[PDB]
Design a protein around this ligand. Structure first.
Ligand SMILES: CCCCCCCCCCCCCCCCCC(=O)OC[C@H](COP(=O)([O-])OCC(O)COP(=O)([O-])OC[C@@H](COC(=O)CCCCCCCCCCCCCCCCC)OC(=O)CCCCCCCCCCCCCCCCC)OC(=O)CCCCCCCCCCCCCCCCC
Ligand SMILES: CCCCCCCCCCCCCCCCCC(=O)OC[C@H](COP(=O)(O)OCCN)OC(=O)CCCCCCCCCCCCCCCCC
Ligand SMILES: NC(=O)C1=CN([C@@H]2O[C@H](COP(=O)(O)OP(=O)(O)OC[C@H]3O[C@@H](n4cnc5c(N)ncnc54)[C@H](OP(=O)(O)O)[C@@H]3O)[C@@H](O)[C@H]2O)C=CC1
Ligand SMILES: CCCCCCCCCCCCCC(=O)SCCNC(=O)CCNC(=O)[C@@H](O)C(C)(C)COP(=O)(O)O
Ligand SMILES: CCCCCCCCCCCC
Ligand SMILES: CCCCCCCCCCCC
Ligand code: SF4
Ligand SMILES: [Zn+2]
Lengths: 244, 182, 151, 377, 89, 67, 115
């Protein structure tokens, strides 16, 4: 059984192996990238027991072709005739600087999904130095949850989620959103006899599970204690609640 | 790419002649300068004098055109010790970091016209010691090269192929006709 | 001692020469933190610019063997490679991009980098071993979800 | 604002500043055989520029230019200024065309109009029709419409030819970086080699026009001109501009010649060097005319009446026209290079001298503005 | 000259705006006229009776290493070394 | 005439001239003759029809193409 | 910390400083014989300024064994310059006369290339 995107491309003694971390999934799985003669070849797992444990998703592995297609190689400026034309770096930089000087106080910035920590820090430093106190992120969040980490953190460890006894999914599909968390939940289902209830539509989690419903009011009911899975979570030794 | 012609096509073609500049040039002065250039290139492609240089193993092959199987003195080619009394320097062997000003000085003190034969893989592009610290990556980046003999030890057949191709390059070398058309 | 002929370069030497030879035969006190950047012959740009990663090399995920994992190594940061316009090879202006230096412990590599003056950092520590129980009776179990469906 | 034409990942700049890399410039260097062309080719090959070098003569004249570039960055071509098809083949894949084509003397096949005017028009028109972005054709410093003859009858045809050529190139190619250099000093030049030669001096005596006092020159070093050509090629803002190329300080010709013979270990007493006015000497002009006549190629020592008019004229800069400091290049003083440059032309090199045998000569005096206006009054 | 704009069997040709076609004004481009794809689909497939067949390049020790191809699946089975096609009716 | 060199000998007579085999190609029935075997060519260096190398792989990184 | 090692030609820092000053004196005497003999385009004052810069970039070291290794290497270059033992191509290597200087500001480094 052989990688078909990596069909006869290179050889394993030739490969420069560089340690990296995949960014497409939110697991942050440790990978090793096969680079030979200044080209990406394939993505392979690197063993971190806490994060991924020799396992990699198909989206994280078979997206080495996406670094070859639809790339941006030149700085482009929309000329006033209506077309985006490739220009030099210095002309693009002074055009963006002239647009910034023409803005005069109304400047905002949005961070995406592939941005690292350092570009976000540099963007926030540029906006705060220019007098703009507004920054943005593409995926939304609750109001007031920024100050405490635990509102946006998988506080139970991914290596600790294999020791969970009963988990509750509130509107998430961990088979596709973060698949190594689903491998940890499958390991805890096989070994630790985990019983799992989910809230939302019917989903296949690659194991047997019960769907409580699609209404949000029963999300209160598990927090109220009237539902039997609230008694399951209270009687469990290591409970958890996973929210998408 | 063209191939050698078939013997019927070869019988259709006439003889090439000794002169690479053609028989007639539609001018008396052009014909006289072309024949003077032919005499000069005959005197220059006859008896080029290589230089006793011999950096490395490829040099041992250089004595196999001295050795009586191949006989470089049959062609006029004869070794001279001084670079002033030499037309050719056969850079043959590993050119290292300490031999960069040595080869540049010996090439510069050699008088014009100058043709350099690069014999051997070390002299062409570094070869088996290309990725080392001390070896200069070929002798092109210090001195000009006109002939690249490709074998690591070339056969002395293959070295005299480079010598004969240098003689054909000198035979096609034109200076008086260039002076008339400059 | 022996009643033979004495050594003439020690008997005829001045008292300043006897003091000079005995002081070089002794042991001086030096700090153990020694910077050897001007001695090693490295250009100063690679000293102030390159970052050194000390790491245990990654196991090949397609291969069960761990013999190549059993060492630590020093490697240097990857600079720009490019395509030469003639023929299409991978030209590189980085002389240190191809050097992996083997070491036994990260403390030895840290002291070596402090000796040679490199800007060092450790990517990851030594991997702890988790005790996992493996036996054949779990595959065929009674009222357990770990009963295997293969075979 | 400034568009990028190529938009190909093989064509963009990549790598560091070495020879094996690519700087994104594909330069065609016309007249690369000559004195400026070697330094221009070396300064291009230091940055990894792919160069097309067209030669009009023999292969042995341009075989020495393979050293400057790496493998694949030097491509030789055969051209002639009477054939536009070879120039069309030469500049068809070039972003930069450098015109160093010129000749100091008349030739039986090419006159001054045929090499400075008409050949420049053929090169500039073919480069404009081939889509070449830049053109860095050179000029002379003292170009004028009607340059008056100072000594000889028939002189200053070269300056008029370069002037007519530079306005017709600026008419034909609308944005050409015209560089006007003064007398250029270097190795293999004509300026130091003309004064150092046997045929210029007469019986160990040096003939100069007005004893060298009334001629003020501002010479420029050749790598400064070459690096100015590189900086004009790399900067797109230098297009359609005229750049004066002079040195940092001004000298008069008598002080320059006396300093040259002080550097050459040719003093007043031991060697017998003396300076006398060339205007009272009718032998030297007949000698220059005979040297220009009987030589089938280059005259011996570069001695011809055009060289006499080139050294006779005074180097005058025009206010409002930018110098080489606008191009970002530093300028090299003669006190850094010419003591090394006149080392092979020193007299009595057989003498195994000690350290204090020969004294280091004094640097020459530099003429100021007020002294120049007092001298020219 | 048509060898500059000719396409090799790896699907490579230089563009008209590329500077790398300036290397071919003095030396002609080498494109191999014998593409391996056309000369391997010109060879007809071999009809066989046995369930498995062996291939060794057709020369013995001078061919490729001997491999066995299964023919129970319908269609044309391609040897991965030499490209010869086998079929079972 | 005066253009002979060692590259004019074809591939079939090359081993007979270099004493590799004692069998001439007239009676050498083991030498193959295929449809794709090209005719012999001499060394074309120093000629307008020489060989000059290039990259055989195409471009592996594709740009955007905004339109 | 503390370590007992064998010394190289000096016990304390004062002798190593004396050896470095002896190197400076010997290189000062050797510079005018370097200039007149090697056929290099460098004035004597430029040579002495380059010698001063070579000592300045090694003023920062403090360890006596490192200082004495530098003294041994400088004595080797002095011995390779008293006897000629070299060419003009290697004497000019201290000045780096062929390398074009690179800018240090971040905008020019951003425009030129990733290095
Ligand atoms: C007289 C004593 C002083 C001579 C002296 O100092 O000569 C310096 C001079 C140094 O040469 P250069 O000026 O550095 O090089 C440029 C060439 O002169 C010029 O380079 P070129 O290759 O263009 O010149 C062609 C070359 C070659 O010419 C030919 O092959 C044509 C032969 C007919 O002819 C010459 O160099 C000399 C031409 C004039 C003398 C011959 C004509 C006949 C009249 C005299 C009898 O020495 C010679 O030229 C030696 C030959 C004597 C010439 C008179
Ligand atoms: C009778 C003795 C004198 C003969 C001179 C003959 C000159 C013309 C000639 O035929 O030269 C032969 C050769 C160039 O002629 P090519 O084209 O090679 O052969 C002619 C084929 N029918 O030319 C040569 O090989 C050298 C010619 C030397 C000419 C010296 C200068 C003459 C003016
Ligand atoms: N002191 C100086 O040198 C000064 C020079 N300039 C200008 O700078 C430029 C370069 O100067 P420089 O290097 O010294 O001059 P050179 O005479 O040394 O070089 C001129 C170049 O042009 C070529 N050439 C000459 N005539 C023709 C022609 N008819 N057709 C085609 N090519 C020809 C020569 O080729 P080849 O050698 O093969 O015959 C050579 O490569 C010229 O335009 C000159 O006017 C201006 C002021 C001072
Ligand atoms: C003409 C060519 C010129 C060639 C120049 C190159 C010469 C070789 C240069 C060298 O030898 S570099 C090694 C010099 N050694 C040292 O610098 C030792 C350490 N230096 C010091 O400690 C200095 O503080 C001095 C030199 C003691 C100065 O301190 P002062 O303050 O007390
Ligand atoms: C061999 C004699 C050469 C004479 C050259 C001219 C000398 C002029 C001297 C004028 C008075 C200083
Ligand atoms: C060959 C002789 C040249 C002499 C040049 C000097 C003449 C000095 C006297 C001038 C009188 C007008
Ligand atoms: S090319 Fe081969 S035979 Fe010649 S010197 Fe190098 S290793 Fe020796
Ligand atoms: Zn097969």
């Amino acid at each position: 059984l052989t990688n078909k995107p990596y069909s006869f491309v290179a050889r394993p003694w030739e490969i420069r192996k560089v340690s990296s971390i995949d960014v497409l999934d939110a697991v942050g799985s440790n990978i090793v990238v096969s680079t030979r003669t200044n080209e990406v070849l394939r993505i392979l797992p690197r063993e971190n027991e806490d994060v991924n444990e020799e396992w990699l998703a198909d989206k994280s592995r078979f997206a080495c072709d996406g670094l070859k297609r639809q790339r941006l190689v030149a700085p482009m400026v929309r000329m006033p005739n209506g077309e985006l034309q490739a220009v030099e770096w210095e002309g693009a930089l002074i055009a963006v600087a002239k647009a910034i000087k023409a803005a005069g106080g109304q400047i905002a910035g949005i961070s995406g999904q592939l941005a690292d920590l350092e570009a976000q820090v540099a963007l926030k430093d540029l906006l705060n130095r220019l007098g703009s106190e507004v920054v943005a992120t593409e995926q939304g969040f609750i109001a007031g949850g920024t100050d405490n980490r635990a509102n946006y953190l998988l506080n139970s460890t991914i290596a600790g989620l294999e020791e969970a006894d009963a988990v509750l999914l509130v509107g998430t599909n961990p088979r596709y959103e973060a698949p190594l968390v689903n491998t940890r939940l499958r390991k805890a289902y096989v070994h630790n006899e985990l019983q799992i209830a989910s809230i939302g539509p019917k989903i296949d989690l690659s194991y047997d599970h019960e769907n409580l419903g699609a209404d949000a009011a029963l999300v209160k009911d598990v927090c109220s204690g009237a539902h039997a899975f609230s008694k399951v979570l209270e009687g469990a030794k290591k409970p958890a609640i996973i929210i998408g | 790419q063209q191939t050698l012609p078939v013997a019927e096509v070869a019988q259709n073609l006439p003889k090439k002649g000794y002169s690479p500049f053609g028989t007639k040039q539609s001018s008396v002065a052009e014909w006289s300068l072309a024949r003077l250039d032919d005499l000069l290139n005959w005197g220059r492609k006859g008896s080029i004098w290589p230089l006793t240089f011999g950096l490395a193993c490829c040099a041992v092959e250089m004595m196999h055109i001295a050795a009586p199987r191949y006989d470089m003195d049959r062609y006029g080619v004869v070794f001279r010790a001084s670079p002033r009394q030499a037309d050719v320097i056969i850079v043959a062997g590993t050119l290292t970091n300490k031999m960069a000003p040595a080869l540049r000085k010996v090439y510069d003190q050699m008088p014009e016209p100058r043709w350099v034969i690069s014999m051997g893989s070390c002299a062409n592009g570094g070869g088996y010691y290309h990725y080392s610290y001390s070896v200069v990556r070929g002798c092109d980046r210090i001195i000009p090269v006109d002939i690249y003999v490709p074998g690591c030890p070339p056969t002395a057949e293959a070295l005299m192929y480079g010598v004969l191709q240098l003689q054909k390059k000198v035979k096609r070398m034109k200076t008086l006709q260039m002076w008339y058309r400059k | 001692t022996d009643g033979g002929p004495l050594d003439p370069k020690t008997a005829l030497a001045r008292p300043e020469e006897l003091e000079q030879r005995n002081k070089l035969s002794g042991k001086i006190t030096v700090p153990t933190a020694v910077n050897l950047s001007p001695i090693s012959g490295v250009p100063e740009e690679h000293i102030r610019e390159r970052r050194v990663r000390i790491h245990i090399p990654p196991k090949n995920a397609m291969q069960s063997g761990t013999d190549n994992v059993n060492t630590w190594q020093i490697e240097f940061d990857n600079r720009e490679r490019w395509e030469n316009p003639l023929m299409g090879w991978a030209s590189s202006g980085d002389p240190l991009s191809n050097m992996n230096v083997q070491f036994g412990s990260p403390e030895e590599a840290i002291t070596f980098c402090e000796r040679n003056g490199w800007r060092w950092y450790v990517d990851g520590a030594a991997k702890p071993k988790k005790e996992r129980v493996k036996n054949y009776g779990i595959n065929f179990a009674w009222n357990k979800r770990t009963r295997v469906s293969t075979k | 604002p400034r568009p990028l034409k190529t938009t190909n990942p093989a064509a963009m700049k990549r790598g560091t500043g070495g020879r094996s890399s690519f700087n994104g410039i594909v330069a065609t260097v016309f007249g690369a055989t000559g004195f400026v062309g070697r330094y221009v080719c070396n300064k291009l090959g230091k940055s990894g520029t792919q160069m097309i070098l067209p030669y009009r003569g023999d292969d042995s004249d341009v075989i020495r230019l393979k050293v400057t570039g790496d493998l694949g960055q030097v491509l030789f071509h055969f051209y002639n200024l009477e054939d536009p098809a070879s120039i069309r083949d030469a500049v068809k894949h070039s972003n930069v065309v450098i015109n160093l084509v010129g000749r100091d003397f008349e030739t039986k096949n090419f006159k001054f109009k045929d090499v400075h005017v008409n050949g420049a028009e053929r090169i500039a028109r073919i480069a404009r029709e081939a889509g070449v972005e830049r053109l860095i054709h050179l000029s002379s410093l003292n170009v004028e419409a009607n340059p008056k003859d100072l000594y000889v009858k028939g002189g200053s045809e070269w300056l008029k030819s370069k002037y007519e050529g530079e306005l017709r190139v600026r008419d034909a190619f609308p944005n050409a970086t015209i560089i006007r250099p003064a007398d250029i000093y270097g190795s293999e030049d004509r300026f130091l080699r003309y004064y150092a030669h046997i045929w210029r001096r007469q019986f160990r005596s040096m003939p100069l026009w007005h004893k060298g006092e009334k001629t003020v020159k501002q010479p420029v070093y050749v790598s400064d001109v070459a690096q100015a050509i590189i900086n004009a090629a790399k900067d797109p803002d230098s297009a359609g501009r005229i750049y004066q190329a002079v040195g940092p300080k001004r000298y008069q010709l008598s002080e320059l010649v006396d300093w040259f013979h002080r550097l050459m270990r040719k003093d007043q007493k031991r060697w017998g060097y003396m300076r006398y006015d060339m205007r009272w000497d009718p032998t030297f002009l007949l000698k220059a005319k005979l040297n220009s006549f009987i030589c089938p190629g280059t005259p011996i020592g570069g001695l011809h009446p055009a060289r006499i008019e080139r050294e006779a004229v005074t180097d005058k800069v025009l206010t409002g026209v930018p110098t080489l400091e606008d191009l970002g290049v530093t300028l090299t003083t003669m006190e850094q290079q010419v003591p090394w440059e006149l080392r092979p032309y020193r007299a009595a090199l057989y003498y195994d001298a000690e350290l204090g045998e020969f004294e280091t000569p004094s640097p020459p005096k530099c003429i100021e503005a007020r002294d120049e206006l007092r001298l020219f009054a | 000259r048509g060898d500059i704009e000719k396409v090799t069997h790896t699907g490579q040709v230089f563009d008209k705006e590329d500077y790398r076609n300036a290397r071919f004004v003095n030396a002609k481009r080498y494109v191999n006229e014998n593409w391996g794809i056309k000369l391997i689909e010109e060879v007809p497939p071999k009809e066989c009776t046995e369930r498995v067949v062996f291939c060794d390049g057709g020369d013995g020790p001078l061919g490729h290493p001997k491999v066995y191809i299964n023919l129970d699946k319908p269609g044309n089975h391609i040897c991965g070394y030499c490209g010869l096609r086998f079929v079972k009716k | 005439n005066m253009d002979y060199d060692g590259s004019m000998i074809p591939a079939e007579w090359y081993g007979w001239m270099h004493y590799k085999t004692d069998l001439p190609p007239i009676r050498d029935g083991c030498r193959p003759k295929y449809k794709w075997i090209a005719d012999h060519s001499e060394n074309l260096s120093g000629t307008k029809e020489a060989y000059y190398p290039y990259s055989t792989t195409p471009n592996k990184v594709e740009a955007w193409e905004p339109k | 910390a503390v370590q007992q090692v064998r010394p190289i030609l000096s016990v304390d820092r004062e002798e190593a400083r004396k050896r470095a000053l002896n190197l400076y004196k010997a290189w000062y005497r050797q510079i005018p014989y370097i200039v007149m003999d090697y056929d290099i385009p460098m004035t004597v004052e430029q040579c002495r300024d380059k010698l001063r810069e070579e000592f300045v970039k090694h003023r920062n070291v403090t360890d006596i064994r490192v200082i004495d290794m530098l003294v041994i290497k400088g004595q080797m270059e002095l011995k390779e310059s008293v006897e000629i033992w070299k060419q003009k191509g290697h004497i000019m290597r201290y000045w780096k006369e062929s390398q074009d200087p690179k800018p240090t500001d971040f905008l020019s480094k951003f425009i030129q290339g990733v290095n």
